[PDB]
Design a protein around this ligand. Structure first.
Ligand code: CLA
Ligand code: CLA
Ligand code: CLA
Ligand code: CLA
Ligand code: CLA
Ligand code: CLA
Ligand code: CLA
Ligand code: CLA
Ligand SMILES: CCCCCCCCCCCCCCCC(=O)OC[C@H](COP(=O)(O)OC[C@@H](O)CO)OC(=O)CCCCCCCCCCCCCCC
Ligand SMILES: CC1=C(/C=C/C(C)=C/C=C\C(C)=C\C=C\C=C(C)\C=C\C=C(C)\C=C\C2=C(C)CCCC2(C)C)C(C)(C)CCC1
Ligand code: SF4
Lengths: 84, 160, 737, 41, 218, 86
C-alpha cells in the first residue's frame, strides 16, 4: 500500500522533522535570524500569530517546503540505487 | 584591523606602496644578494658575475632555433652568434656609460637606507665604476659563452 | 505609493522644441541649436536633479520600447502568413529556400524576385523564423495570422500602460528602491513561470505534432493541437505513460515519464537538431531551479536575506572595509546599474552566439548554412556593442555620481589609488601579446617569400599544438559512461566522438580538429580583446583626474580638449576613450567572424555521397593557408569575393550594389576623421559671402560641426560602412554555395 | 488645436510630407511612362 | 471586536468603521499610504459590495433551474446546467427567441445605461438627480453614500429605519455576499473538474460520500 | 611590513587531514578519489621518466584532488585567522 510505503514514511518524517526544528529553535524563523557565526538573534515580525512560541503561517509554509524538498531528494536518491 | 598593504616607508605622499611582492622578507633577501645590489663591492667583480650568467644563457636559443639548427654546424654557429650579441651589448654599455657620466664628479646614488641610516653611495654611478663594470661584463660574457659551448660540444654529456 | 495626475496631457509642449532644457528653449540663433536638440533628448539627468522624476521618466520609456518590439514581432508573424512559402517549405525543407518578402515591379526591381522553390518568387530570408515556427508545431497560416493579431493587441496594451503610468498614476521613489522584491519577482515569476509555461506548451503541443511530422505524415493530415488535449487516447497512443495521468508525479514515481523526458544528448538523425524531449526536460528543470531561487531575499514576512547585510560581511586583510557602502551606490544611481547590466547582457549575447552553432536547437537549422552564419555574426556584433556601452556608462557614473563625502566605498577608493600599476601592467601585456601573436604571421610570410618553408611555424615544420584545448575535447568526448553515466551521447558532436550526422546529402556537424593555425588565431583574439579592455579601462579610471589635468572632473564627461598647452591635450575626456575603443571592438569582431566563416567552410560544411566521402566547400585549405597574411588575402578575400562581384543580372544583385555602397560610405568617413573644424568654418565664410550678395543669407547663421560631433559622425559612418560591406559579402557568398 | 497645427508646421514633419508626396508623384510618373531615355515630343 | 489573521500593519488602518471588518489584510492592499489608481480603500470597499451583490444574484440563479428540473416542476428542456444554457456554445446551446449575439447587444445597451449612471453618481454625488430623465430623476438623487443609495426606488419597503438595525443589516449583507463569492468560485472549479452540474454533484456526494469525493474525482 | 601571513603551521596538518579523511570514502564504484589518484601516480611511475600521455586519466585526478585540497587549506587559514578579528 502507498500509505504504509517507504515513500510515505520518508516524506512524513522529513516534513515533521523540519516543522519541529523550526518551532523549537533548531532552525531560522520570522522571529530568529542567523548571524555570520550561525547564531540565532531574536527578531519581532509584527505578525499576530496566536501561538505561545510566536510560530507564524510564513514559518509553517517555509518549514513545510524545506521538508518536502529534502524528502523528495532523499526518496529519489534511494530509488535510483535500488534501495527502495 | 590587520592590513597588509602600507604606504612606502610610512610616507603616504610618495608615489609607491609596500606590498608582499615588494617587501616580503624572502624577496627582500633575494634581491639584496644579487650582484647589481652589492654597493660595497668592486664593480668589476659584480660585472664579471653578471657577464658570466648572461653569456651562459644566450647560447641555448641561438643554437636550438638558428637557421643551421638541423646541420652539423649548429653549435659553432650558435656560439658565434651569442658572442656577437655579447659584443653588441658591451658596446651599448660602453656608449651609455660615456654618455651619462662625467669624469671627476661624485656618485649620484642615494646615501640613505630604508631605516634612515647613512651609507656610502654606490660607486657604480661614476665613470670609473661603470667602465670597470663594462670591462668585467665583457670578460664574463665571453667566458660564459665559451664555457657553455665547451660543455655542450666538447664533452658528450647525456643532456636532454 | 503613486501620485494622481502629476503631469497634464497637452499638445502645448509639442510646439516649443527644447522645452526640456533652459538653454535650448531660448531659440535658434545658429544651426548648432538644431544639433543640440537631438543629442540631449534622452539625458534625463541633465533635465532635472530630482531622482523621483528621473525614475518616472525611465519607467515609461521601457513601455514604448516594448510596444515597438511587439509591433516588430507582429509584422514578422504577419509577413509569414501573407507573403511567404512556409506551407510549401513545410513539405520539403531540404530543397526549398525560405522566403517571406516580395517586391513591387516598378523600375525593373522585380529581378530581385528570384525563384526559391515551391512555386514562389521572392527574397530569401536568413532569420530562421521557419524553423522556429516548425519547432512550435505551427502548420497553417491561420495560426500565424492569429499570432500577429495578438502581438498587435499587446503593442496597443503596452502603449496604453506607458501613457497611464506617467500621466495618471506615477509610482513614488520608495517603490523603485525595493530591490529585494524586484529580484524575487523577476526570478520566481518572470523567468521560472515563463520556463514552466514553455515546458507545458512543449509537452502538450510541440512533441506530438513534431513526432507526426518526423514520421512522414502530410502536414494537412496531422490532428490539431487541441485534439491532443480533449482526446487523451491520442496522446496515450503516442505516449503510453499519459494513460496514468498525473499520479506518477505526486507519488514520486517520476521514472514513468521517461518516454517524453529524456537525457539522450546529441542530435536527431532525421532533422539534425536537438531532441525535443531533452528540451522539455531542460525547461522543466530550469523552471524548478528559478522558482526555488526566487525565495532568497527578505520582504514583509521577515524570512530571507538582506542584500546590505550580505555585502557588509565580505571584507578582508587586503581590502579593508570591503563591500560596505555598495548598497547605497546601486540604489541611487541609474548609470552604474545600466553599465553593469549592459556588460552582462553583452557577455550573455556572445555566449549565446557561441552555443547555438555547436548544439543546433531547431530542426533543419544545421544544414541551412546561411542562417547559421547570419545568426552567429548578428549576435557577436550585438554583444560587442553592448559591452562598449557598459564602459561608456561606467565613465558617466564616475564623472557625475561619484561623491565620497556621502557615498564612500573602500573597494572603489582602493582601485583609484593604484591605477598606474594596473594601466602599466595592461600595457605590457598588450605589447607582449601583439609581439608574440602577429609577429609569428610576419615570420611565416618572410620565410615563405624567401623560399624556406621548413622554417615556418606550421604543422609540418615547427608545430605549436594547443594541447590544453585538445585535453578538454578528449575529456568531454569520454564523459558519457565515466563522469556522466546518465548520458547516452556527448553534449556536442564537436568534442571528437567520431560520429557524423548527415541530413539530406549535407553535413550537419562533425568533430572539429585543432592545430597550429587555431593556436595563432586564438592568441590574435586574446590580443585584440586585451587592447580593447586597455582603452576602455584607462578611459574609466582616469575620468576625474590625472597628472596632466588635475581638475578634469570640472570640465565634464564630454569635452574636446583643454587647449594646445602642456604640449597638447586633444582627446583627454572619457568620451574619447569610448570613441577610440569602438574601432578596436570593430577590429576584434571582424577577425572573429572571419575565423568562424573560414573554419566552417573549410573543415565542417560540405556534401556527403552514397559511399560516405565528404567534400567540403573549400576543400580543407584552412590548415596550410591561414598561417600567413598572404593566405588570408588570397584564399579567403580574393577567392570568396567572386560570388558578390558576379551577382549583377541575377536575384543577388542587391548584395552587389550594397557592396559598393558600403565601400563608398566607409571611405566617406575619412573626411571627418582626418580633418578639423577651423578649415570648414573658414570655408563656410566664403560661401556665406555670395548668399549675402543675392539676398539669400539665412537668419539662422550656418556653423561648422563641433569637434565632438565631427568625431561621432566619423566613427558612425566608419562602422556602418565596414559592417555593411562584410554583411553583403557574407550573404552573397553563402546564399550561392 | 492651434498647438497641434503649430507642430504640423515644424521642419521635419513638413519635409517628410513634402518628400512623401514628391516620391509618390515620381513613382506614378515612372509607372505610367517607363524607360524614358529621350524627350520625343 | 473579534480578529482574524490581523497584523500590526493591517490594524493601523482597519479600525472597525467599515461593516464586516475583522482586520484581515495580509497583503496590505488597503494601506492608505499613497493611494492611487484603482488601489484605494473606498474603491476596494465599493467593489467588494458590488461583487457580493452580483454573486448573490448569480449563486442562486445558476442552481434554481436545475433543482426544479429534478423536482419535476419545469420542462426538462429548460432544466439545463449553467454551462449548457448558452453561456458557452461549445459546451452546448439553447435556441431562444433571438440569437445569442443579438441578445448580447441589448444586454450591453441596457447595462451600459444603468452602469454609466451609477458611475457618474459615484464621480459627482447627487448629479444624477438634476437633468430631465423621463421624470425619473426625482427619485434617483442618491444619498451621498455610493454603496447605499436608498430612496423610493432602491429602498421601497423602507427597511433599516433605525441606525443600529441598518448597521446590523449591512453586516449581514457583507457576510452573505462573501459566502456567495465563495460559492461561485466553487461552481466554476466544480464544473471544470467534474463536468456536470453542482446540484448533481451534491446529490452524488450525498449518495455515497466516500466513492464520490475529491479523492475519487481528481 | 613583515610577517604578513601571521604564520600558523597547524593549518597545514589540519587541512591535509580534513581533506584526506572524507576523500578516502570509496563512494566511486568501490574506489575513492584519493585511492584513484594514488593508483594513477603508481601507474605513471612504471615508465619513468616518460611523462603521462594526453589521454591518461592522471591529469583529471590531479586537478580534482588539488582543487579540494587547496579549498580546505584556504578555508582553514581564513577560519583560524578570522576568529580573532570579527
Ligand atoms: C539519503 C540521501 C541521499 C542520497 C543517497 C542521494 C543520492 C543521490 N543523489 Mg541526491 N539529494 C539529497 C539526498 C540524497 N541523494 C537531498 C537531500 C537533496 C536536496 C533536495 C538532493 C539533491 C540531488 C540533486 C539535485 C541531484 C542528486 C543526485 C543524486 C545521485 C548522485 C549522482 C551523482 O553523481 O551526484 C545519487 C543517487 C543527482 C542525480 O540523481 O543525477 C542523476 C542530482 O542531480 N541529489
Ligand atoms: C515594423 C515592421 C515592419 C516592416 C519593416 C514592414 C515592411 C514592409 N511591409 Mg509591413 N506590416 C507590418 C510591419 C512591418 N512591415 C505590420 C505590423 C503589419 C500589419 C499586421 C503589416 C502589414 C503589411 C501589408 C498589408 C503589406 C505590408 C508590406 C510591406 C512592404 C512594403 C511596405 C510599403 O510599401 O509601405 C509603404 C509605406 C507606407 C507608409 C504605407 C515592406 C517590406 C506590403 C507588401 O509586402 O507588399 C507586397 C503590404 O502589402 N505590410
Ligand atoms: C504551466 C504549464 C502547464 C499547464 C498549463 C498544464 C496543463 C494541463 N496538463 Mg500538464 N504538464 C506540464 C505543464 C503544464 N500542464 C509539465 C511540465 C508536465 C510534465 C511533468 C505535464 C504533464 C502532464 C500530464 C502527464 C498530464 C497533464 C495534463 C494536463 C491537463 C489537465 C490538468 C491541463 C491542460 C493531463 C491531461 O492531458 O489531461 C487532459 C495529463 O494526463 N500534464
Ligand atoms: C539600453 C541601452 C542604452 C540606454 C538606455 C542608453 C541611454 C543613454 N545613453 Mg547610451 N550607449 C549605449 C546603450 C544605451 N544608452 C551603448 C550600447 C553605447 C555604446 C555604443 C552607448 C554610448 C553612449 C554615448 C557615447 C553617450 C550615451 C549617452 C546616453 C544618454 C543620452 C542618450 C541620448 O540623448 O541619445 C540621443 C540619441 C541619438 C542622438 C540617436 C543616435 C542615432 C544613431 C547614432 C544613428 C542611427 C542611424 C540610423 C539607422 C539612420 C537613420 C536616420 C534617419 C533620420 C533617416 C542616455 C542616458 C550620452 C550621455 O549620457 O551623455 C552624457 C553619450 O554621450 N550613450
Ligand atoms: C595597421 C596599423 C596599425 C598597427 C600596426 C598598430 C599597432 C599598434 N597599436 Mg594601433 N591603431 C591603429 C592602427 C595600427 N596600430 C589605428 C588605425 C587606430 C585607430 C586610431 C589605432 C589605435 C590604437 C590605440 C588606441 C592603441 C593602439 C596600440 C597599438 C600597439 C599595441 C601594443 C603592441 O605592441 O602591439 C604589437 C605591435 C605590433 C604588432 C607592431 C610590430 C610589427 C611587427 C612585429 C614588426 C616588428 C619589426 C621588428 C621590431 C624589427 C624592425 C626593425 C627595423 C630596423 C626594421 C601596437 C604597436 C596601443 C598601444 O599604445 O599599446 C598598448 C593603444 O592603446 N592603437
Ligand atoms: C532657397 C535656398 C537657396 C538658394 C537660392 C541657394 C542659392 C545658391 N547656393 Mg546654396 N544652399 C542652400 C540653399 C540655397 N542656396 C542650403 C540649404 C544649403 C545647405 C545644404 C546650401 C549650400 C550651398 C553650398 C555649399 C554652395 C551653395 C552655392 C549656391 C549658389 C550657387 C548656385 C547653386 O545652385 O549652388 C548649389 C546649391 C546647392 C546644391 C544647395 C542645395 C539645394 C537645397 C537643398 C535647396 C533648399 C531650398 C530651401 C529648402 C528653400 C525652402 C523654401 C520654402 C521655405 C518656401 C547659389 C547662389 C554655392 C556657391 O556659389 O557658393 C557661395 C556653393 O558652393 N549653396
Ligand atoms: C492599387 C490601386 C491604385 C491605383 C489604381 C492608383 C492609381 C493612381 N495613383 Mg495611386 N496610390 C495607391 C494605390 C493606387 N493608385 C496607394 C495604395 C497609395 C499609397 C497610399 C497611392 C499613392 C499615390 C500618390 C501619392 C499619387 C498616386 C497617383 C495616382 C494616379 C497616377 C496618374 C496621374 O498622376 O495622373 C493624374 C491623376 C489622375 C488622372 C487621377 C488621380 C493614378 C490614378 C498620383 C496622382 O494622383 O497624381 C495626381 C500621386 O501623386 N497614388
Ligand atoms: C545626375 C545624375 C542622374 C541623372 C541625370 C539621371 C537621369 C535619369 N535616370 Mg537616374 N539615377 C541616378 C542618377 C541620375 N539619373 C542615381 C544616383 C540612381 C540611383 C538611386 C538612379 C536610378 C534610376 C532608376 C532606377 C531609373 C533612373 C532613370 C533615369 C532616366 C529618367 C527617365 C524619366 O522619365 O525620369 C534619366 C535619364 C529611369 C530610367 O528608365 O532610365 C532610362 C529609371 O528607371 N534612374
Ligand atoms: C595575487 C593572487 C590573486 C589575488 C588574490 O589573492 O585575491 C584575493 C586577495 C585578498 O582578498 P581579501 O580576502 O582581502 O578580500 C576578499 C573580498 O571579498 C573583500 O571585498 O585579493 C587581493 O589582495 C587583491 C588582488 C588584486 C589583483 C592582484 C593582481 C592579479
Ligand atoms: C500540533 C498542532 C497543529 C499541527 C499542524 C500541522 C503540523 C500541520 C502541518 C502541515 C503543513 C503546514 C504542511 C506544509 C507543506 C508545505 C509545502 C509542501 C509547500 C510548498 C512546496 C513546494 C511548492 C514544492 C514544490 C516542488 C515541486 C512541485 C517539484 C520539485 C520538488 C518540489 C518539492 C520543490 C495545529 C496547527 C493543527 C494545531 C496546533 C497544534
Ligand atoms: S582645437 Fe583641436 S587641435 Fe586644438 S587643442 Fe582642441 S582638439 Fe587639439
Amino acid at each position: 500500500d502507498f500509505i504504509g510505503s517507504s515513500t510515505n514514511l520518508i516524506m512524513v518524517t522529513s516534513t515533521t522533522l523540519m516543522l519541529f526544528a523550526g518551532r523549537f529553535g533548531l532552525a531560522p524563523s520570522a522571529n530568529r535570524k542567523a548571524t555570520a557565526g550561525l547564531r540565532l538573534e531574536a527578531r519581532d515580525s509584527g505578525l499576530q500569530t496566536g501561538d505561545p512560541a510566536g510560530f507564524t503561517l510564513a514559518d509553517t509554509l517555509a518549514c513545510g517546503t524545506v521538508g518536502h524538498i529534502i524528502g523528495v531528494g532523499v526518496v529519489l536518491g534511494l530509488k535510483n540505487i535500488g534501495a527502495i | 584591523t590587520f592590513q597588509v598593504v602600507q604606504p612606502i616607508n610610512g610616507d603616504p605622499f610618495i608615489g609607491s606602496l609596500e606590498t608582499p611582492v615588494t617587501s616580503s622578507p624572502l624577496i627582500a633577501w633575494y634581491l639584496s644578494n644579487l650582484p647589481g645590489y652589492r654597493t660595497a663591492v668592486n664593480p668589476l667583480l659584480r660585472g664579471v658575475e653578471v657577464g658570466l650568467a648572461h653569456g651562459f644563457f644566450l647560447v641555448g636559443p641561438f643554437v636550438k632555433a638558428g637557421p643551421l639548427r638541423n646541420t652539423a654546424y649548429a653549435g659553432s654557429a650558435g656560439s658565434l652568434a651569442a658572442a656577437g650579441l655579447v659584443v653588441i651589448l658591451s658596446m651599448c654599455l660602453t656608449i651609455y656609460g660615456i654618455s651619462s657620466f662625467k669624469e671627476g664628479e661624485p656618485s649620484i646614488a642615494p646615501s640613505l637606507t630604508l631605516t634612515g641610516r647613512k651609507k656610502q653611495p654606490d660607486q657604480l654611478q661614476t665613470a670609473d665604476g661603470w667602465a670597470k663594470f663594462t670591462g668585467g661584463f665583457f670578460f664574463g660574457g665571453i667566458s660564459g659563452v665559451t664555457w657553455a659551448y665547451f660543455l655542450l660540444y666538447v664533452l658528450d654529456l647525456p643532456y636532454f | 505609493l503613486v501620485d494622481r495626475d502629476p503631469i497634464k496631457t497637452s499638445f502645448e509642449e509639442w510646439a516649443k522644441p527644447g522645452h526640456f532644457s533652459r538653454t535650448i528653449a531660448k531659440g535658434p540663433d545658429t544651426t548648432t541649436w538644431i544639433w543640440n536638440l537631438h543629442a540631449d533628448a534622452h539625458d534625463f539627468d541633465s533635465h532635472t536633479s530630482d531622482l523621483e522624476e528621473i525614475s518616472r521618466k525611465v519607467f515609461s520609456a521601457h513601455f514604448g520600447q516594448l510596444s515597438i518590439i511587439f509591433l516588430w514581432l507582429s509584422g514578422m508573424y504577419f509577413h509569414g502568413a501573407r507573403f511567404s512559402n512556409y506551407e510549401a517549405w513545410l513539405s520539403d525543407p531540404t530543397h526549398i529556400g525560405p522566403s517571406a518578402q516580395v517586391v513591387w515591379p516598378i523600375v525593373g526591381q522585380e529581378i530581385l524576385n528570384g525563384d526559391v522553390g515551391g512555386g514562389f518568387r521572392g527574397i530569401q530570408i536568413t532569420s530562421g523564423f521557419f524553423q522556429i515556427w516548425r519547432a512550435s508545431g505551427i502548420t497553417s497560416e491561420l495560426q500565424l495570422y492569429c499570432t500577429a493579431i495578438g502581438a498587435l493587441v499587446f503593442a496597443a496594451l503596452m502603449l496604453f500602460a506607458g501613457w497611464f503610468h506617467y500621466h495618471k498614476a506615477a509610482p513614488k521613489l520608495a517603490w523603485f528602491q525595493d530591490v529585494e522584491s524586484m529580484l524575487n519577482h523577476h526570478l520566481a515569476g518572470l523567468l521560472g513561470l515563463g520556463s514552466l509555461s514553455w515546458a507545458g506548451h512543449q509537452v502538450h503541443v510541440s512533441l506530438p505534432i513534431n513526432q507526426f511530422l518526423n514520421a512522414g505524415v502530410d502536414p494537412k493530415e496531422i490532428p490539431l493541437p487541441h485534439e491532443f488535449i480533449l482526446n487523451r487516447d491520442l496522446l496515450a497512443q503516442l505516449y503510453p505513460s499519459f494513460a496514468e495521468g498525473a499520479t506518477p508525479f505526486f507519488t514520486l514515481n517520476w521514472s514513468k515519464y521517461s518516454e517524453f523526458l529524456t537525457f539522450r544528448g546529441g542530435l536527431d538523425p532525421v532533422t539534425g537538431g536537438l531532441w525535443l524531449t531533452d528540451i522539455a526536460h531542460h525547461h522543466l528543470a530550469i523552471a524548478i531551479l528559478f522558482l526555488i531561487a526566487g525565495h532568497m531575499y527578505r520582504t514583509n514576512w521577515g524570512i530571507g536575506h538582506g542584500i546590505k547585510d550580505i555585502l557588509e560581511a565580505h571584507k578582508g586583510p587586503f581590502t579593508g572595509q570591503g563591500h560596505k557602502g555598495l548598497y547605497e551606490i546601486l540604489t541611487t544611481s541609474w548609470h552604474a546599474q545600466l553599465s553593469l547590466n549592459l556588460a552582462m547582457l553583452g557577455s550573455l549575447t556572445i555566449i549565446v552566439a557561441h552555443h547555438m552553432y555547436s548544439m543546433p536547437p531547431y530542426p533543419y537549422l544545421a544544414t541551412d548554412y546561411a542562417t547559421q552564419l547570419s545568426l552567429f555574426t548578428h549576435h557577436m556584433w550585438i554583444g560587442g556593442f553592448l559591452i562598449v556601452g557598459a564602459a561608456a556608462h561606467a565613465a558617466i557614473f564616475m564623472v557625475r555620481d561619484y561623491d565620497p563625502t556621502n557615498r564612500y566605498n573602500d573597494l572603489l577608493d582602493r582601485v583609484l589609488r593604484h591605477r598606474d600599476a594596473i594601466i602599466s601592467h595592461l600595457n605590457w601585456v598588450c605589447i607582449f601579446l601583439g609581439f608574440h601573436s602577429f609577429g609569428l604571421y610576419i615570420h611565416n610570410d618572410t620565410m615563405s617569400a624567401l623560399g624556406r618553408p621548413q622554417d615556418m611555424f606550421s604543422d609540418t615544420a615547427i608545430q605549436l599544438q594547443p594541447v590544453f584545448a585538445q585535453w578538454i575535447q578528449n575529456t568531454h568526448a569520454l564523459a558519457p559512461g565515466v563522469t556522466a553515466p546518465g548520458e547516452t551521447a556527448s553534449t556536442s558532436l564537436t568534442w571528437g566522438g567520431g560520429e557524423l550526422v548527415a541530413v539530406g546529402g549535407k553535413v550537419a556537424l562533425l568533430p572539429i580538429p585543432l592545430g597550429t593555425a587555431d593556436f595563432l588565431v586564438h592568441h590574435i583574439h586574446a590580443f585584440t580583446i586585451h587592447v580593447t579592455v586597455l582603452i576602455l579601462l584607462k578611459g574609466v579610471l582616469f575620468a576625474r583626474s590625472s597628472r596632466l589635468i588635475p581638475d578634469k572632473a570640472n570640465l565634464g564627461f564630454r569635452f574636446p580638449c583643454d587647449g594646445p598647452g602642456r604640449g597638447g591635450t586633444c582627446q583627454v575626456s572619457a568620451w574619447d576613450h569610448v570613441f577610440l575603443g569602438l574601432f578596436w571592438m570593430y577590429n576584434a569582431i571582424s577577425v572573429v567572424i572571419f575565423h568562424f566563416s573560414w573554419k566552417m567552410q573549410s573543415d565542417v560544411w560540405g556534401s556527403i555521397s552514397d559511399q560516405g566521402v565528404v567534400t567540403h566547400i573549400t576543400g580543407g585549405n584552412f590548415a596550410q593557408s591561414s598561417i600567413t597574411i598572404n593566405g588570408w588575402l588570397r584564399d579567403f578575400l580574393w577567392a570568396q569575393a567572386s560570388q558578390v562581384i558576379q551577382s549583377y543580372g541575377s536575384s543577388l544583385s542587391a548584395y552587389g550594389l550594397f557592396f559598393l555602397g558600403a565601400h563608398f560610405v566607409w571611405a566617406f568617413s575619412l573626411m571627418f576623421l582626418f580633418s578639423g573644424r577651423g578649415y570648414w568654418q573658414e570655408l563656410i565664410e566664403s560661401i556665406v559671402w555670395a548668399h549675402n550678395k543675392l539676398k539669400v543669407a539665412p537668419a539662422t547663421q550656418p556653423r561648422a560641426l563641433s569637434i565632438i560631433q565631427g568625431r561621432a559622425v566619423g566613427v558612425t559612418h566608419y562602422l556602418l560602412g565596414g559592417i555593411a560591406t562584410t554583411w553583403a559579402f557574407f550573404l552573397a557568398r553563402i546564399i550561392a554555395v | 488645436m492651434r498647438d497641434l497645427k503649430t507642430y504640423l508646421s515644424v521642419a521635419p514633419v513638413l519635409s517628410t510630407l513634402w518628400f512623401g508626396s514628391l516620391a509618390g508623384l515620381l513613382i506614378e510618373i515612372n509607372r505610367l511612362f517607363p524607360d524614358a531615355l529621350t524627350f520625343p515630343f | 471586536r473579534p480578529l482574524w489573521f490581523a497584523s500590526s500593519q493591517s490594524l493601523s488602518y482597519l479600525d472597525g468603521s467599515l461593516p464586516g471588518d475583522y482586520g484581515f489584510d495580509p497583503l496590505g492592499l488597503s494601506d492608505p499610504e499613497g493611494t492611487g489608481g484603482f488601489i484605494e480603500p473606498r474603491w476596494l470597499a465599493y467593489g467588494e459590495i458590488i461583487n457580493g451583490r452580483f454573486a448573490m444574484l448569480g449563486a442562486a440563479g445558476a442552481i434554481a433551474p436545475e433543482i426544479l428540473g429534478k423536482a419535476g416542476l419545469i420542462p426538462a428542456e429548460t432544466a439545463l446546467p449553467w454551462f449548457q444554457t448558452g453561456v458557452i456554445p461549445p459546451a452546448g446551446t439553447y435556441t431562444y427567441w433571438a440569437d445569442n449575439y443579438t441578445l448580447f447587444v441589448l444586454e450591453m445597451a441596457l447595462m451600459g445605461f444603468a452602469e454609466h449612471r451609477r458611475l457618474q453618481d459615484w464621480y459627482n454625488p447627487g448629479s444624477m438627480g438634476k437633468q430631465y430623465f423621463l421624470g425619473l430623476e426625482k427619485g434617483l438623487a442618491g444619498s451621498g453614500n455610493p454603496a447605499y443609495p436608498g430612496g423610493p426606488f432602491f429602498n421601497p419597503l423602507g427597511f433599516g429605519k433605525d441606525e443600529k438595525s441598518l448597521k446590523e443589516l449591512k453586516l449581514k449583507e457583507v457576510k452573505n455576499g462573501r459566502l456567495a463569492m465563495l460559492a461561485i468560485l466553487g461552481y466554476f472549479i466544480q464544473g471544470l473538474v467534474t463536468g456536470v452540474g453542482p446540484y448533481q454533484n451534491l446529490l452524488d456526494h450525498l449518495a455515497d460520500p466516500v466513492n464520490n469525493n475529491v479523492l475519487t474525482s481528481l | 611590513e613583515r610577517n604578513w601571513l601571521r604564520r600558523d603551521l597547524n593549518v597545514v596538518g589540519f587541512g591535509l587531514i580534513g581533506w584526506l579523511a572524507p576523500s578516502s570514502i570509496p563512494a566511486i564504484n568501490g574506489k575513492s578519489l584519493t585511492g584513484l589518484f594514488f593508483d594513477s601516480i603508481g601507474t605513471e611511475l612504471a615508465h619513468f621518466p616518460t611523462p603521462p600521455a594526453l589521454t591518461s586519466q592522471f591529469w583529471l585526478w590531479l586537478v580534482t584532488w588539488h582543487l579540494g585540497l587547496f579549498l580546505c587549506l584556504t578555508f582553514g587559514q581564513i577560519g583560524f585567522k578570522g576568529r580573532t578579528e570579527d
